[PDB]
């Protein structure tokens, strides 16, 4: 319809990307491909690599917060198991 305002992209043919020249692509007509043959092996290798690149980012924060929750709970058993009779006073006073 009517032209729009300022934009960082357009439509097909005039998207607005950087000018480039010298790139060649290909394709193999997926009908004549027989696409998947080692799907289980591909999945195994991809999962291995993805886990290899992200060791600590999942193991560390969950571990530290499990430790924090464990500390809170164990303080609770030091208090809230037939023992509050002699520590609730010092907690609340």
């Amino acid at each position: 319809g009517p032209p729009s305002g300022k934009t960082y992209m357009g439509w097909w043919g005039h998207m607005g990307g950087p000018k480039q020249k010298g790139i060649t692509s290909y394709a193999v007509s997926p009908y004549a491909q027989k696409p998947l043959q080692g799907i289980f092996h591909n999945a195994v290798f991809n999962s291995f690599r993805r886990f290899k690149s992200q060791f600590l980012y999942v193991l560390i924060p969950a571990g530290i917060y499990w430790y924090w929750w464990k500390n809170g709970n164990e303080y609770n058993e030091f208090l809230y198991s037939k023992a509050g009779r002699e520590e609730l006073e010092r907690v609340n006073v």
């Binding site: 060649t24 290909y26 394709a27 193999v28 007509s29 997926p30």
Partner: protein
């Protein structure tokens, strides 16, 4: 007139024609750019340029005779035109050039000069000629891993790789007696029939040409030589065609002729044709049409080539043409069949009976090598009057209905749908 053929190793075929008065004689080999490994493609064109480098001075100075050559895929020929009374000296030069002497021609400095000239020519072709480059890339991407996709003039690295060893190997392995045929198109009758069968006129290497293992194939693919600096956009399509010596060649030719060609800037070409021309005339879409049916010994290529400037509507331009192909494969009117018959008769009579004997000799050699005898105009007309709407429908059902296609493009092809929206427009409608 009718042609006469005989064969004792060498085949002598003549098409006598008193209408013309420029006798010609040459040699057509059955091996071209389709029988060479991709190690160094540029050998046949290198030989062609070698023949077109220094013997031109010899033929011009010694007597009156002009020589020319052309190699496309397997019609490698070296035609030597002449005057009607100079066929003897023409064959004398041919004999002195292609058996002995064959050493002074392959001089070193001459070889590097020819190599530089060929490198410059191929670089110029790659830089400038887009409409033929897209077709060459279509050939390259339609026959992947097969000696039918490599370009007919080679690549830069292929030309710069080898020097003399593989050239002489090609000469020894493909310039033989098995697949060599002489031609006598022009204004001669029977002297060619005898002069070729002579003690002095023999061809070296009376052996056999090596046979390839993987003959040919066809798989859909894409190539996108996207150079957005170029103003226009050149794209092409192709479907598995039909080789020569098949009882459907004329049917495919008529199917190609039905849609025909079109030029936007020519008023005559804008005022005829079929429904798709009106559909693309309503909203301007493209400038050129070229419906082709390329046929070689091993396989064929029936497709579509075009060039457009309205880069935004490439999808519409492709969609209309594919829908018209589907209309052809579902329902054809007899009036367009009759007009296609007449147009094909006109174009084939123009092509097979042009005034230049060089083209006639090339066609005669191409027919003789893989046929054994040329098919005259009358028989072609007889075989084309039998083409019917049912035959065209049955043929298009097998070839144009859910078959692999290959697209080659360059320029500004941002709007070109990659592979699925361009292939799923054949059998996914309300059939």
């Amino acid at each position: 007139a009718e042609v006469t053929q005989l064969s004792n190793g060498i085949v002598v075929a003549t098409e006598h024609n008193p209408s013309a008065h420029t006798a010609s004689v040459g040699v057509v080999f059955g091996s071209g750019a389709a029988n060479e490994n991709p190690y160094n493609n540029g050998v046949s064109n290198l030989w062609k340029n070698i023949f077109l480098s220094k013997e031109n001075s010899a033929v011009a100075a010694k007597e009156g005779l002009a020589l020319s050559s052309n190699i496309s895929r397997d019609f490698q020929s070296y035609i030597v035109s002449s005057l009607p009374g100079s066929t003897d000296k023409s064959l004398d030069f041919l004999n002195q050039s292609f058996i002995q002497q064959k050493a002074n021609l392959l001089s070193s400095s001459n070889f590097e000069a020819t190599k530089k000239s060929v490198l410059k020519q191929v670089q110029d072709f790659e830089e400038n000629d887009h409409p033929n480059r897209v077709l060459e890339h279509l050939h390259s991407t339609a026959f992947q891993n097969t000696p039918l996709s490599l370009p007919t003039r080679g690549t830069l690295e292929s030309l710069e790789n080898l020097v003399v060893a593989d050239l002489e190997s090609f000469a020894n392995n493909h310039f033989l007696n098995s697949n060599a045929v002489v031609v006598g198109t022009g204004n001669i009758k029977h002297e060619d029939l005898v002069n070729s069968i002579e003690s002095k006129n023999l061809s070296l290497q009376t052996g056999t040409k090596p046979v390839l293992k993987k003959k040919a194939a066809f798989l859909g693919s894409e190539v996108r030589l996207r150079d957005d600096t170029l103003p226009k956009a050149w794209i092409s399509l192709a479907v598995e065609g039909e080789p020569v010596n098949s009882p459907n060649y004329f049917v495919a030719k008529l199917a190609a002729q039905i849609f025909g060609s079109y030029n936007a800037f020519e008023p005559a070409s804008r005022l005829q044709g079929i429904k798709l021309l009106d559909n693309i005339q309503e909203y301007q879409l493209c400038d050129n049409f070229n419906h082709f049916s390329l046929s070689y010994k091993d396989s064929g290529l029936w497709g579509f080539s075009t060039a457009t400037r309205n880069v935004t509507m490439i999808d519409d331009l492709i969609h209309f043409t594919l829908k018209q192909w589907n209309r052809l494969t579902i329902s054809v009117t007899d009036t367009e069949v009759e007009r296609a018959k007449s147009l094909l008769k006109l174009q084939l009579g123009q092509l097979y009976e042009s005034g230049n004997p060089v083209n006639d000799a090339n066609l005669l050699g191409a027919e003789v090598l893989i046929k054994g005898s040329k098919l005259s105009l009358g028989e072609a007309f007889k075989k084309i009057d039998a083409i019917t709407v049912k035959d065209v429908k049955a043929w298009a059902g097998k070839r144009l209905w859910d078959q692999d296609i290959a697209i080659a493009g360059t320029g500004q092809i941002e709007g070109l749908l990659d592979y699925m929206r361009i292939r799923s427009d054949m059998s996914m409608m309300r059939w």
